[PDB]
Every structure is written in C-alpha cells, then in structure tokens.
Amino acid sequence: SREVFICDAVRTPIGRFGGSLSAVRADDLAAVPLKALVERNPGVDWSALDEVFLGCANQAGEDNRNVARMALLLAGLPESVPGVTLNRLCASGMDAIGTAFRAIACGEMELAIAGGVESMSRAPYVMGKADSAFGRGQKIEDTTIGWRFVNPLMKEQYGIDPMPQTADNVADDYRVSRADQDAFALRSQQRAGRAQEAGFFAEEIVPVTIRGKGDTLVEHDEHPRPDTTLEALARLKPVNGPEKTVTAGNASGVNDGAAALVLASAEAVEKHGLTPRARVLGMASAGVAPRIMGIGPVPAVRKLLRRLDLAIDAFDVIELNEAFASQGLACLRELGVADDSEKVNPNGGAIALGHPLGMSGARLVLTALHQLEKSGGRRGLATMCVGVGQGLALAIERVL
Amino acid sequence: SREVFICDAVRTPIGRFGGSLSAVRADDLAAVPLKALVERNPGVDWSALDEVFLGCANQAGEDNRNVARMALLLAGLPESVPGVTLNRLCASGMDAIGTAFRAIACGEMELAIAGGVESMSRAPYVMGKADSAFGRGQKIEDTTIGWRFVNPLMKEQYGIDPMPQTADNVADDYRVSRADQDAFALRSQQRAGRAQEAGFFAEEIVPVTIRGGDTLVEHDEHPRPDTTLEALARLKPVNGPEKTVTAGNASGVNDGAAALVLASAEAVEKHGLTPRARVLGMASAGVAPRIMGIGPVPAVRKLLRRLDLAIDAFDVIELNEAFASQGLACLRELGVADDSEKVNPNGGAIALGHPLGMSGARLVLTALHQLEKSGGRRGLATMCVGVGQGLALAIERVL
Amino acid sequence: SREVFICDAVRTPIGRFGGSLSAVRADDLAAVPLKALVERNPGVDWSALDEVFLGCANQAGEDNRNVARMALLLAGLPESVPGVTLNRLCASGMDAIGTAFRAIACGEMELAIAGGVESMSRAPYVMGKADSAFGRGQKIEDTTIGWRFVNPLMKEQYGIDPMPQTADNVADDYRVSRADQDAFALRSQQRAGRAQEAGFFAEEIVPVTIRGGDTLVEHDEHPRPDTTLEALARLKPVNGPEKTVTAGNASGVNDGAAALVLASAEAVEKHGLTPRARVLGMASAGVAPRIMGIGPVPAVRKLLRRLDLAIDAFDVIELNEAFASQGLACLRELGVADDSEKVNPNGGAIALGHPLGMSGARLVLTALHQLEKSGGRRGLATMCVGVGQGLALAIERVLEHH
Amino acid sequence: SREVFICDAVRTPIGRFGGSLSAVRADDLAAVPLKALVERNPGVDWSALDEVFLGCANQAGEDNRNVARMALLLAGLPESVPGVTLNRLCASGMDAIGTAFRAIACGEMELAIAGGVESMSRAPYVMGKADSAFGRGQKIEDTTIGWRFVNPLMKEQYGIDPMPQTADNVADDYRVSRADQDAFALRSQQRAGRAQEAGFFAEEIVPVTIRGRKGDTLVEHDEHPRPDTTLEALARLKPVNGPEKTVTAGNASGVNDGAAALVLASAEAVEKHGLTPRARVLGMASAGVAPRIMGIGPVPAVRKLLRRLDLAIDAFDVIELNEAFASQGLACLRELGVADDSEKVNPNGGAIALGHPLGMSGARLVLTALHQLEKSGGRRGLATMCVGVGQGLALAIERVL
Numbered sequence A: 001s002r003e004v005f006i007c008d009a010v011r012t013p014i015g016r017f018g019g020s021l022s023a024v025r026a027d028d029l030a031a032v033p034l035k036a037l038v039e040r041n042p043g044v045d046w047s048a049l050d051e052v053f054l055g056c057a058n059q060a061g062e063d064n065r066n067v068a069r070m071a072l073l074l075a076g077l078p079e080s081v082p083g084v085t086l087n088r089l090c091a092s093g094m095d096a097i098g099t100a101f102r103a104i105a106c107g108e109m110e111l112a113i114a115g116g117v118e119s120m121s122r123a124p125y126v127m128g129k130a131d132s133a134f135g136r137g138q139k140i141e142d143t144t145i146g147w148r149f150v151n152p153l154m155k156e157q158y159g160i161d162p163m164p165q166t167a168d169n170v171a172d173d174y175r176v177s178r179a180d181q182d183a184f185a186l187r188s189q190q191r192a193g194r195a196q197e198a199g200f201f202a203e204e205i206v207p208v209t210i211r212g213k214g215d216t217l218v219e220h221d222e223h224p225r226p227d228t229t230l231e232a233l234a235r236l237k238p239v240n241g242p243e244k245t246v247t248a249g250n251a252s253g254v255n256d257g258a259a260a261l262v263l264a265s266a267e268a269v270e271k272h273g274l275t276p277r278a279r280v281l282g283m284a285s286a287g288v289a290p291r292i293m294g295i296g297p298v299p300a301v302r303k304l305l306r307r308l309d310l311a312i313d314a315f316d317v318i319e320l321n322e323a324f325a326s327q328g329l330a331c332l333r334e335l336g337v338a339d340d341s342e343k344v345n346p347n348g349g350a351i352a353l354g355h356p357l358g359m360s361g362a363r364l365v366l367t368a369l370h371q372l373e374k375s376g377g378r379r380g381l382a383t384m385c386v387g388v389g390q391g392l393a394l395a396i397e398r399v400l
Numbered sequence B: 001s002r003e004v005f006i007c008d009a010v011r012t013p014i015g016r017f018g019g020s021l022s023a024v025r026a027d028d029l030a031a032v033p034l035k036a037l038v039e040r041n042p043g044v045d046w047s048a049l050d051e052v053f054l055g056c057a058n059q060a061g062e063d064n065r066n067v068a069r070m071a072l073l074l075a076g077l078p079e080s081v082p083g084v085t086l087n088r089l090c091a092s093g094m095d096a097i098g099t100a101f102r103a104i105a106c107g108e109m110e111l112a113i114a115g116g117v118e119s120m121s122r123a124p125y126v127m128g129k130a131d132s133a134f135g136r137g138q139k140i141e142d143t144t145i146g147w148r149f150v151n152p153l154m155k156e157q158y159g160i161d162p163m164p165q166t167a168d169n170v171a172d173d174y175r176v177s178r179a180d181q182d183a184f185a186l187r188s189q190q191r192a193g194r195a196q197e198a199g200f201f202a203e204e205i206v207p208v209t210i211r212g213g214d215t216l217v218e219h220d221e222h223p224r225p226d227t228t229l230e231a232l233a234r235l236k237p238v239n240g241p242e243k244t245v246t247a248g249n250a251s252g253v254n255d256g257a258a259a260l261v262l263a264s265a266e267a268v269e270k271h272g273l274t275p276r277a278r279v280l281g282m283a284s285a286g287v288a289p290r291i292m293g294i295g296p297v298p299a300v301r302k303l304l305r306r307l308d309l310a311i312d313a314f315d316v317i318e319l320n321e322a323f324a325s326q327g328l329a330c331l332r333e334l335g336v337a338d339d340s341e342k343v344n345p346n347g348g349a350i351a352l353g354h355p356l357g358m359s360g361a362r363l364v365l366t367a368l369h370q371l372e373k374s375g376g377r378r379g380l381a382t383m384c385v386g387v388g389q390g391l392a393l394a395i396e397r398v399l
Numbered sequence C: 001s002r003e004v005f006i007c008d009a010v011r012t013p014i015g016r017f018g019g020s021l022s023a024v025r026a027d028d029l030a031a032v033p034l035k036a037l038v039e040r041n042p043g044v045d046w047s048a049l050d051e052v053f054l055g056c057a058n059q060a061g062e063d064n065r066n067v068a069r070m071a072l073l074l075a076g077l078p079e080s081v082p083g084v085t086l087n088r089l090c091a092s093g094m095d096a097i098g099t100a101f102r103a104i105a106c107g108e109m110e111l112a113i114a115g116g117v118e119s120m121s122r123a124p125y126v127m128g129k130a131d132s133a134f135g136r137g138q139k140i141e142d143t144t145i146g147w148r149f150v151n152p153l154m155k156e157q158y159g160i161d162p163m164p165q166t167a168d169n170v171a172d173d174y175r176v177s178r179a180d181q182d183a184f185a186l187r188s189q190q191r192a193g194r195a196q197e198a199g200f201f202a203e204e205i206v207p208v209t210i211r212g213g214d215t216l217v218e219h220d221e222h223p224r225p226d227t228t229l230e231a232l233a234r235l236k237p238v239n240g241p242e243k244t245v246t247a248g249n250a251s252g253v254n255d256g257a258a259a260l261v262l263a264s265a266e267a268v269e270k271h272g273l274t275p276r277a278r279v280l281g282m283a284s285a286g287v288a289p290r291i292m293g294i295g296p297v298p299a300v301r302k303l304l305r306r307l308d309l310a311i312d313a314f315d316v317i318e319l320n321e322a323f324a325s326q327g328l329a330c331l332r333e334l335g336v337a338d339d340s341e342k343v344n345p346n347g348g349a350i351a352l353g354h355p356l357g358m359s360g361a362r363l364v365l366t367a368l369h370q371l372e373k374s375g376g377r378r379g380l381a382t383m384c385v386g387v388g389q390g391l392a393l394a395i396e397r398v399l400e401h402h
Numbered sequence D: 001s002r003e004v005f006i007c008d009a010v011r012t013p014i015g016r017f018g019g020s021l022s023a024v025r026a027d028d029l030a031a032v033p034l035k036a037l038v039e040r041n042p043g044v045d046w047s048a049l050d051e052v053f054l055g056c057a058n059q060a061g062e063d064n065r066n067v068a069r070m071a072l073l074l075a076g077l078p079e080s081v082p083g084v085t086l087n088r089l090c091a092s093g094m095d096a097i098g099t100a101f102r103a104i105a106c107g108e109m110e111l112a113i114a115g116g117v118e119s120m121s122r123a124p125y126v127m128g129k130a131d132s133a134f135g136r137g138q139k140i141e142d143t144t145i146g147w148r149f150v151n152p153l154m155k156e157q158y159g160i161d162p163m164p165q166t167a168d169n170v171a172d173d174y175r176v177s178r179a180d181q182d183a184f185a186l187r188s189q190q191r192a193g194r195a196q197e198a199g200f201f202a203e204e205i206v207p208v209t210i211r212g213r214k215g216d217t218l219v220e221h222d223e224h225p226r227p228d229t230t231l232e233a234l235a236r237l238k239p240v241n242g243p244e245k246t247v248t249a250g251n252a253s254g255v256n257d258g259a260a261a262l263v264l265a266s267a268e269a270v271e272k273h274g275l276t277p278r279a280r281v282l283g284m285a286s287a288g289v290a291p292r293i294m295g296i297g298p299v300p301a302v303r304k305l306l307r308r309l310d311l312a313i314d315a316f317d318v319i320e321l322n323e324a325f326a327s328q329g330l331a332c333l334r335e336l337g338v339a340d341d342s343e344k345v346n347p348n349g350g351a352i353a354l355g356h357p358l359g360m361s362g363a364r365l366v367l368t369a370l371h372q373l374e375k376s377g378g379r380r381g382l383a384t385m386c387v388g389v390g391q392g393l394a395l396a397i398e399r400v401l
Helices: A026-040 A067-074 A089-105 A152-160 A163-173 A176-198 A200-204 A230-235 A266-272 A289-297 A297-306 A325-335 A356-377 B025-039 B069-075 B091-103 B154-159 B163-173 B178-198 B200-204 B229-233 B266-270 B287-292 B296-307 B324-334 B354-373 C028-039 C066-076 C090-104 C150-160 C164-173 C178-198 C200-204 C229-233 C267-273 C289-294 C294-308 C324-334 C356-374 D027-039 D068-072 D089-105 D152-160 D161-172 D177-198 D231-236 D266-275 D291-296 D298-309 D326-336 D358-376
Strands: A003-010 A051-055 A084-089 A109-117 A125-127 A140-141 A208-211 A214-217 A255-264 A276-287 A316-318 A379-386 A390-398 B002-011 B051-055 B083-087 B113-120 B125-127 B140-142 B206-211 B214-217 B254-264 B276-285 B314-319 B376-384 B387-397 C007-013 C051-055 C085-088 C111-119 C125-127 C140-142 C209-210 C213-219 C252-263 C277-286 C316-317 C378-385 C387-395 D004-012 D051-055 D081-085 D111-119 D126-127 D141-142 D207-210 D217-219 D256-265 D281-287 D318-321 D379-388 D390-397
Touching: A003 A026, A003 A200, A003 A356, A026 A067, A026 A109, A026 A255, A051 A067, A051 A356, A067 A109, A067 B154, A084 A089, A084 B140, A084 B276, A084 C229, A089 A109, A089 A255, A089 A356, A089 A379, A089 A390, A089 B091, A089 C140, A109 A356, A109 B206, A152 B069, A152 B163, A163 A289, A163 A325, A163 C085, A176 A200, A176 A230, A176 A325, A200 A356, A200 C378, A200 D089, A255 A266, A255 A356, A276 B314, A289 A379, A297 A325, A297 A379, A297 A390, A316 A325, A316 A356, A325 A379, A325 C209, A356 A379, A356 A390, A356 B387, B002 B025, B002 B091, B002 B200, B002 B266, B002 B354, B002 C213, B025 B069, B025 B113, B025 B254, B051 B069, B051 C387, B069 B083, B069 B113, B083 B091, B091 B113, B091 B254, B091 B276, B091 B354, B091 B376, B091 B387, B091 C007, B113 B354, B125 D141, B163 B287, B163 B324, B178 B200, B178 B229, B178 B324, B200 B354, B229 D266, B254 B266, B254 B354, B276 B314, B287 B296, B287 B324, B296 B324, B296 B376, B296 B387, B314 B324, B314 B354, B324 B376, B354 B387, C007 C028, C007 C200, C007 C267, C007 C356, C007 D177, C028 C066, C028 C111, C028 C252, C051 C066, C051 C090, C051 C356, C066 C085, C085 C090, C090 C111, C090 C252, C090 C277, C090 C356, C090 C387, C111 C356, C150 D068, C164 C289, C164 C324, C178 C200, C178 C324, C200 C356, C252 C267, C252 C356, C252 D379, C277 C294, C277 C378, C289 C324, C289 C378, C294 C324, C294 C378, C294 C387, C316 C324, C316 C356, C324 C378, C356 C378, C356 C387, D004 D027, D004 D266, D027 D068, D027 D111, D027 D256, D051 D068, D051 D089, D051 D358, D068 D111, D081 D089, D089 D111, D089 D281, D089 D358, D089 D379, D161 D291, D161 D326, D177 D231, D177 D326, D256 D266, D256 D358, D281 D298, D281 D326, D291 D326, D291 D379, D298 D326, D298 D379, D298 D390, D318 D326, D318 D358, D358 D390
Parallel strands: A051 A084, A051 A109, A316 A379, B051 B083, B051 B113, B314 B376, C051 C085, C051 C111, C316 C378, D051 D081, D051 D111, D318 D379
Antiparallel strands: A003 A255, A003 A276, A084 B083, A109 A255, A125 A140, A125 B125, A208 A214, A276 A390, A379 A390, B002 B254, B002 B276, B113 B254, B125 B140, B206 B214, B276 B387, B376 B387, C007 C252, C007 C277, C085 D081, C111 C252, C125 C140, C125 D126, C209 C213, C277 C387, C378 C387, D004 D256, D004 D281, D111 D256, D126 D141, D207 D217, D281 D390, D379 D390
C-alpha cells in the first residue's frame, strides 16, 4: 500500500423527483461536477487523469453504455481519459471512491476522479423482448425505484420486499419505535436547516444551469423540510399499513444529483499542485438478508474497523446514510452509538437532503471530509445500506 | 511482492442471438459459472468469499440492479457475500478481474470471484418518460447493441458511429485491406475448429441446464468451421460497396458468462486452492470514439511501460476480435505479425462470438488455459471498448 | 320508407388537446350526452330504445371494444339496449345519424340514439407485436392524429399525405389563395363569437362534471373571437413559406361528444316526443386521398341528384371547416359564395375545433338548431374524410300549420 | 322497404393464432375477398359500387383508420368508392351485412359489399399517454382479446368477466353440463370434418398467397379444425377457470385470423350488373343482455327478429349459431326450443372447429347459411351470435327460387 489523498470535491444540489433538476439528462448531470473540478483546479494537466470512476444504480436511461465515459467527454476532459461505471445500487458512489483508492494504493494509477450520479426523475421504462412470434406477454416496468424483471427463484428464496417494507422489517426485528424514528427524522431536518442557513451546503455545491425563456441556475438542495415538527411526523400514515412504522416523513425520497472527488498518490499531489485534504484508510463491504438490507452497515463497519484495528469511538464524524430512520437507529444501536449522537450526521442526512442512489455514497465521503475540516476532527467513517442486502463502509483521516 | 493468484476459472458456452442460451435470464446465466466454481472447489469455506465482481454492459434487463449480487444469491452463495457490477462496455469482464486484483493487491480482501455476463438475446427495449402531460413524443429503443438516448452534444463533438462504422474508419485510417481482414477471419475460424476438435473449449466450459424434459448446452454455437476465403470474399460490406467490414470478418451478437477465483498467498494456503497464474497488472486508455478499435494500442503500451516489458515478452496474446480491421491495425502498431501464432492461438470472437460483459473474462481465462497447454510463461489479454477505450491485463503462469 | 324524426339533441363543450376535457375518459365522455338525453326526456320508457349508434375514429384507447355499448351502460341506460360503433374517421358522427335513419326508415327499429365521441387528448400509443422470437424491430406510434402502421402498397399508390398537406394540395389544385383562406377563418371566428355572446352554443351544450371538489365544464375552449386578419396573415404555413394552410385557417385537435334522438311517427306518439326535423337522406363519395378536402362535392351532388334538389333549396349548409382551403374549394365547386350567410352561420370547426367522431353529429345538431332560430326549412350537413371521402346528410324542419 | 339480394360471397380460410395467415396485415387480409369479388364478377361496372361496409372489432393495428376504405383501395377498387367500418365486437361482420341491407332497402344505395376482417395474431399492444410530467403509471395491454383500459365504474356495476368466465356463468345459470358441452364440441368437429372432406369449405374459400425467401405458401384450408377429436380427449381437459367449472379450450372456439365479403344489390342493380340473386335478406335485430351472461344474447335478438317477421323458429331450414362456447350454444338452443343435436343447427360445424376471427365470423355465418340453403334446397336461414359486453345479433335470409 502507498497513501491515497482525497483533494477537491464538489456536488450538484439534490433535486426532488420531477423538480429543479428533472430537465437535466443523467449524462449531462454527471458532467457538471467533472467540469467544476477542471475549472476549480486550473494548475492540473488533465491529460494525466488516469480514470473517471462513477457510480450509477440505473444505467438504462441517458446513463446507459458507461456514463463515466459519456460524462467525462461531455465535461470537456481529453478523449485519452478512460472511464468505468460501478453499480452497487445505493452505495455505487462510495464504491467508485473505494475502487479509485485501491487502484492508486497498489500503484496502478496516480490520479483519478471518483463519484456518482442518479437521475431518478428521468429513469426510463423497460420492456422485455417477446421470446416467441406474436408474444402476448410483453409488459413495461418503471425503473425509478423498485424491482423489475423479477426472478421467481429470487422472490421464492429471498423475497422482493420494497425498500420501505425492508425498513419495516428492520423496525420489527430490531424494535425501533415510530416515536424514535420520528425524533431521528426531526433531528435530520433541524440539523440540515441550521447547516443550510450557515451556508455549509453552499460550500459543497456547484450550480447547475438549466437552458429553458432564459437560462436559470439551480444552487439550493430542494428536498429539505426545515419547518418539520414532531407533531406533523406523528400524523403521517405508514407506507405499509396502520400497524407499521415507516412513513414518507421518517424516510428519504426519490431524487436527482451528481458528485465527484479527486484522488491522488503523494507524487500526483506534488506534480499537479493539489491540496491533499484527507487520507483514505480503507473500504469494506458485507452481505445481509435482503429482507433487512438496512442493517447492512453493521457488518460492513465491523469488517473495516477490525482490519484497521480501530473502535467506533476513534471517529469524530460518522456519515450513516438515512435511507430510513428505522435502519439508521438500528445500525447505531448495534454499533453502540447514541441515537442522538452529535458525531453522527451532524448536518443532517438523506431524510432532509434526498437519496439519488448513485450520488449518495460520494456525497457522504465529501460531507464527512467537509465536516472534519470545519470541526478540526481527525477520522471520518461513511457507511450505507444497499438494496438486496449489503452494506459498505469507507474511513478517511484529515491531513494535518 | 503481495501476489494475487488466479485459481479455478470456467465459462458457459457462447450462444448465438436467439440461439441455444436465449431462454436463460441474464441473472440465471451469470449464476451458472458461480455455482460451477462452488461445486468444483468444495474444500473452500465460501463464507470467506470477500466479493463477487461481474462485468455487464447492459444492466437494463434481467441483469438490472447489480447482477453480481443477484447472481451470487441465485448460485447458492451465502447472503453474507457482497457483490458489485462493473460497466466498461466490451471490457467489463476484464475490468472485473483487474478490480478484484487491485482489491486483493492492496490488502483490502483475500478471496474474490470476478467475471462477466451478457444476454444480448434478452436485452430489453427502453422508453423515456413523458416530460409533459399527454406527451406525444415517446418512443422505444432496442438495447441489444448500439446507441440509445443519444445526447446531441455527444453526436456533434464525437459522433455516434455504430461499431462496424468505427471498424471501417480504422480500416481506412490504418490502411487495412479487405483481403487482410478476410484472411485474419479465416485463421480465427480454422484455429477455432482445431481447438474445438482437440476438446480445448470443452475444458473451459461448464454446461447450462435448459428446462423444457431438460437439455444441456455444452458447445459454443457461433463458430463457422467450414468458412472459406472465397465465402468471405463474396460478402457485401455493412456500410456499402466501397468499405471493408462485413458480417464474416467481424464478431456477432451473443450470450454467455464466465467467472475466475482470485486469491492472496494466504487464501490459497487457507482454502487448499491450486494457484495457476499471478496477475501482473491492468491498464486502460481512451481514444477517439470514431476509431475505438485502436484502443488496445495505448492500453497495452501503458501496461508494458509500467511492467518494463516489450510485447515479445508474451507467449500468448488474447486480442479481442471485435473486427479483423482493428485486430490487424493493433497488431501492426504494436510490432506483432498479422498471422502470429502467439495471437489468439485457438481463434477469437470472429469464431466464438462477443457477449460484451463476458468477453474480457473469457480472454483472461483462455490465455491462462493456453499457457498451461503450451508450457508458456506470460499472457497478455487486451480489447477495444465502444466510445473509444482499450483495456489490457497481463498474467504469468506459476512455477 | 317511413318518415324519421330528429327529436332532442345535445353536445358537450369541445375542449382543446390537453385542456378542459383532457381528464375525462373517452367512454365516460360519450356517456355524458346519453345521460343528458335520458334526464331531459324523463317521460320516455328508455327500455324501448332499440339501439345506440356512436361514431368514433380511434377505438384503441378508453373508446375500445364498441364505445357505443360501453357508453350506454355507463350512462345508466338498461343493459337490454344494444349499441354499435361506426368509423368513417372525420364523418363517423354523421354516419351514426344516417345509419340510425336507415334502420328506422325500412321499419327495422322505432327509436334510436345516434352521435359520436372523440378524445384526441387521451388517444393512446400503439405497438405492433414482434413477428419473430427476440424481434428487435418493435416501435410505438401516437394515435392522436395521422398515419400509423403504414402499408407500403398504400404509400406507393395513394400516398400518406398528412391532413394539412392534403389541404395545401386542394389550395394548389383548386387555386385557393392564402388571403381568401384567412378571410374565411376570420368569418368563422367572428360568427362563432356572436353566437357565443347570444347564448346559441349554451343551448346546445350539457355540462361535463370534472371530479377533483368537482368543477363543471360548460363552454367551448377552442374559439379565438379576438382573431384579426392581420394576426392570421402573420402566421407561418405548416408545410413551408410557399404554402397556404396555417394553424389559424385550419381546425385543431379536440375532445367532445354529442347525441341525438331519432324516432318513427309511431315512437314519437308512443313516447310523447317533440319531432323537430325529418331526415331526407345521406350519401357518401370517394375522392383521391391527396385531395380528401374536396370529398363533399361528389357527396353533396350524389345526395341532391337522388333528392331532386338544387344547392339553393337549402336555408342552412354546415360544411365542416377542417381547412379553409377545402371549405372554399367545396363552396366554389357547388356554386355557393365564399362568404354566404347560409354556410356555417354560427361559424365552424376553425373556431369550435374538430373531435373527429363527434363533429358530424355536431353539424346535424347545429344545422337543425339554426333552422329553428331562422325559421328556415331544409338543412344540408357535409364534411370531408381522411383517405378521400365526403359525407352529406339533409334534414327538413318539421313546420306547424295554423 | 324494397327487396335486397345477396349475390356472390367469399371468405379466406381461417388461420390459427400465429398460424397460416399470421404474416398477412389486417388491411391486406380484408383486401383479399374484395379482390376476389371483383375478379369473379367482371360483368359489374365497379365504379357503380356505392359502399364497402366491413366489421372489425379491434381497429388499433393495421386495421386502424377505417379498414373498409383502406382495404377497398388495396383491393384495386376505384378511389370514387367510399367505405365505412362497423364495431359490434363478435357480431361486427353480421352488422356490416345488415347495415348494407338497410341502406339498399330504404332506397339510399343500389350496390354494396359487406363483410368483416380480424387479425387476432397481429392485434397490437396499446399504451395510455402519461397525464403528468415524468408519470410513473404507464402500462401496455395486449388487444388480441379481453378487457383493456378498464373503467372502474364498468367493473363495479357490470364486472369485466373474461369471455370464458361468461360462458361458465351461462353453464351455471342455465344448467348446461360439462358432458353436454363436450358432446356439442365433438359434433362440431365431426360435422366440420365431413364438410371439409366433402369440399363444402373449398366452395366458400378464396386462397391467400404468402411470399418470402422460402417461396410461396398457398393458404387454402381452414387450420383450426381438430377432426381427430374424441369425447374422452375432451373429457380429460382442465377447465379454464378451475376444477369446479365446465368451459375448456376443447368446448370453446379460439383466437383466429380471416376475412369475408358479400355483394348486396337491389333488383335493378342485379339486372344492370348481370349478378345472380341467391337470397333475399328478410331483416336483422339486436338485443342487450347482462355482460356477465353475454352468451345468451342470441335468445332476445332471435325472438325480436322472429316477432317482427311473424316466423316461428321451425320455419328455418338452417340455423347458424356462432359457437363461441358450447355452454352458450346449448343454452340459446334450449331457450329457443331447438334440440341440442339438431341437424338444422350448424349442419357443417361451427366456430369450435373453424375458429372465431371476431369481425369476420358474422359475415361467415351469413355466407355459409346461404351456401347450406343452396346445397340442401332449404328456403329460410337464420344466422345469430353472442357479443362481448352482452349483446346478440340475428339476421334472416330466404333462398331465391
């Protein structure tokens, strides 16, 4: 192993479904943070960029045929730069970062961009080919979210629980009450409201231009509900019926966004005049039962911390993706961290900010690093649950 | 050094479009080699498997939402095993192996499976959402091959040349005659027919069970062993009578899957594995989309500069045969004879077909197979990528 | 042949594409005039209704599988009442009336409803089946307007000219200027604006209930009563600057339904109906598809030859205004002045819109309405048809004596 | 009401779903009987044809935008000849004949062609527009058979029972046993088998030629019959709607492709054009019933026609009762007072053997009733059929002496 440094990092705002980014093609959306990294670091010879690594969970729409390569071409990067796209659903953007990290760490590259994109607004319909002449069985399925082309052997053995059903399964199996879930969701809105007002998100964001009438600029996260009250949350009806616990209020949404980071060896930092902001420590993955996918981060974090020989206490910032309050609380309880820890999602998370699957994992690493710089903390841990039962964890350390 | 070894490696047969594997869902197809590797190596505690890495170029069909994880669950691997899917179009399967290699090389994992899948038979149609109430503008597009949801900025700047058009561009720009392309295609069919008859492909292949009573698919379906130079010389070019690329000097559209075991020294010792090769390294390069077939040249050169090796250092070169034109253009730029017996000794994709995600993994698997049969040392696997890339991966047989 | 009477007649307002009626399923929309006739004539034993005949040009969407029978059931008519749907594209609604007329005229039934419906807003996409395992050639086609599933034998022999191109072919071959087309369009907008202001259309219309709180849709959405000659003269032609057909001298894409009661002398007496007109007859004709707009000329001639009437025996002529070019070319062939006050006296489809299946029912309904207002005797309704047809239907107001 | 004659009449063979006619566009298929009427009757000035009327149940596919006019143009008929398409689902082709009849009977025209077409093989999929930006609710529906774009009000008030369910409802409410349904099915296959061997269908049929790189196929024979059907093979089939029900694939018609067309003429037109008058049309009547028991539709349609003509059912030498399902065939015969096994009912078999291309079937019933009257020397024929969403239609004819 040699050392690997995260240098510059930017993200787009995150839009609501059908919202402020809904007119931006996924490939063009993935380009925006790449173009911004080129314009923010003008001292770099971009023909020395070894690879662009992007996470993308869909890849059926405008993000088809390796959107990493589509996006780097659209962003103005030299045609000599290769690109590759990663799919670990919800954790694709974190996976891109770990994958760029491992490539640099064993000496195969010097300089890379890793991040992620999802346009859930523009997710297309898919239709299976007829497998016989004049086939009457064709159907179209929405790829915004959820299962399509269901394998009967998968449904039989593992189920096809929608994500909110998995979050109810976690609330049942780990005993996470409606009240604790709603209190977690309120803290995410409150912390994100304070961060919004302080300009913490504006420090992360690069704006998107919508060419419409006249050009407009998207600059603000659209998903947050900073006026949320505990009383409003307690009135919401659960997604899966009156005795369940998961609601639209204690869960993230469907969203659009992109993010990208520079990773570099020590030599690349010195050749290209980069600011090394953090060292990557490592990434680990784990499988769990698909029906309780939200608990994924517990064995992923434990595999990483065992190999790094570190306790959860060694971390000043923990970014635990808030796909659902039920699974966030259950992961914190298993790992021995207080429900309301100020070290965990200190500026709020996905319940406030939304969850464009491919982008989210890149956002978590980006914002952990950002919060370490503001707080003068040392170690950061980013972790998230993954559809069909996985977790992923990635640790960093601020450069002193 | 911190060595990474390729152990067991297997592949399905390769099916024609609408052919012998066309009834097998992409996810079930991917699961076939994973289940074969489990059954062939029962001394392994499979709960110690760190990751499944699969290449897949499409991911809109039965391969959606991370086919690596779908396939490992369908194959019977424990749910504790994570999976991730890579997309570098044509080279996805080679990228999977290189990615597993890097994860083990830097100490993050011990034991991985890497491979690839493509069901081009069962690739779906895609339809964009309406952006307006009562939208009249919707259309469906085929994802079997080629461009869909064309970005007009991509089309203006780099073009949207179909793969056979790029191959014609390489023929013109690198002066590769029709006659040279057709002779290359004939050698592929002849080398392939010999290897078939010798039972070489059968040693790589694990059979696919098709449920009707039940049948077994065991034989590669794409090869045309009775091909003649006169039969190739008579075909009309895809892009008109001036041009050189035909259906005969080109790969087709195909279905298949492959998977390899990769392991640290420690994992080999712990799980009683047979190490067969050491992975030396992988490199990628970009080129102009319009001549994507030349991608292997700067990828090979990047890898060989880092390893400190000349192209003559390799006993086997597996160069994907997407198009005879780009195969020859690459061989001539690299200083290797058109007809070299070191290059694709048992034939390539013109004969065997090209299920995108699978091909990269097949090239590594079969390079290692050929090294064992010949007593050679170093193998080089390389291939072009749609939208202008190349990938190269080098291996070395163990002593 | 016995006499056949038109009794009560009603229509929905006509909506724009994606406008005021765009949320109403085609079948529900067809039910609205049927239900209005039942509630307006509560005297009648509706179990004696012999048939519902509706026109509909599309029948792929919510109007699939015989919208006449769907609509009569949704309207609350007894399940004992049968229904049949007619498709002569643009003239389907007129054909429904003429078909009811003929059934009653040769004694096969006593009492019918005839009308038409179109929801061009909600027209679906269609997709051919794959003719081979793993077929790669599938596509989807919009059914809102225009050609789909094109037969190469039809394209080669007759062409697949879009409707506005056929209107440009009629303007070229019959020499109809841009300026005469624009002046014909202006007259339709002015005439319809006077008719709107007087409450003439409100008398035709029954409201559509939109479920949200519920709203009512009560007035035509398509008219542009502030239209000026200057504003029409500025519009760019559909098929390029050397052509004449525009958005302003042509009808639109529209939603609407209409229905009329038809009865024998015996049904009028038995059910206590008010007879308002007798049907004199219907005739159809084919022309070249490329000049479909001239269809009404041989249709009107064939009808008037059999009825032994000249064109000036008609107090009202409702000529569908699909395009000003073909309206003018038709009036000039029949010897009727471009600006006649007998022709479309309350304006036409350039103002009101053209929901294909409904328009033909609307023309007969509004011809009869105009006869009652003016004290006129005979009306003629005639319209052009896609792929080269014309249809013409003549009525005579029932006159009292002493 | 003056007299109206049926003159020449022809049909394609009936193909199976995805079978012998499956490569023929619906509009080209409809053109084949029209082209054959022209070639068989060169004594006609075809510029005097007043109208082509075709039945068609679907009209979403290659049959879109008035297939009557598309087909007469493809058939080579002059562009001066108008056409109109009727939709009464299963009865559309009978409706076309009645409609041509009524136009001639009240003096509005002299010479017409009437018939029907269905290509159930090539029926397309239909997809509703999204009613909102980025709508997630779109779906496609097969239009081969069955409900699409279901109205929740129709489902709540009347149901959306598929056709076989309606036939099970008729078997339950009218007490029609599985045994009687299978014996009815067997008689249809045996009668169609004898008619086939006798060349009876060959006299009705004009061939379709299909081209391609494997050469020409001449399609000449009905493909749906299973003349080797046995009672024990019928009795082994599993019912469509579960073990308690009676309707099977063996005691029901299928999904099929075909076209048919008939010449109708006034006395004067018969004279002027050198036509052979074969039958007088007596009349047509329609009736509604509950959609859930649509198979009983022919009972009130027949009773209404026979009341107005002042005829008893026994005045007919031939009854062509469409065999959509044996259950409704038998229920209708028992209501009209005609024996289950009558030799006057479907003497040459019916839709259980021959198939049911919706728009075409009603035209075939009238065509083949007239044919059987000519072979037998019978005087009066009755054609009747049930209709999806609860109708019947009945049409009566009289052989010219």
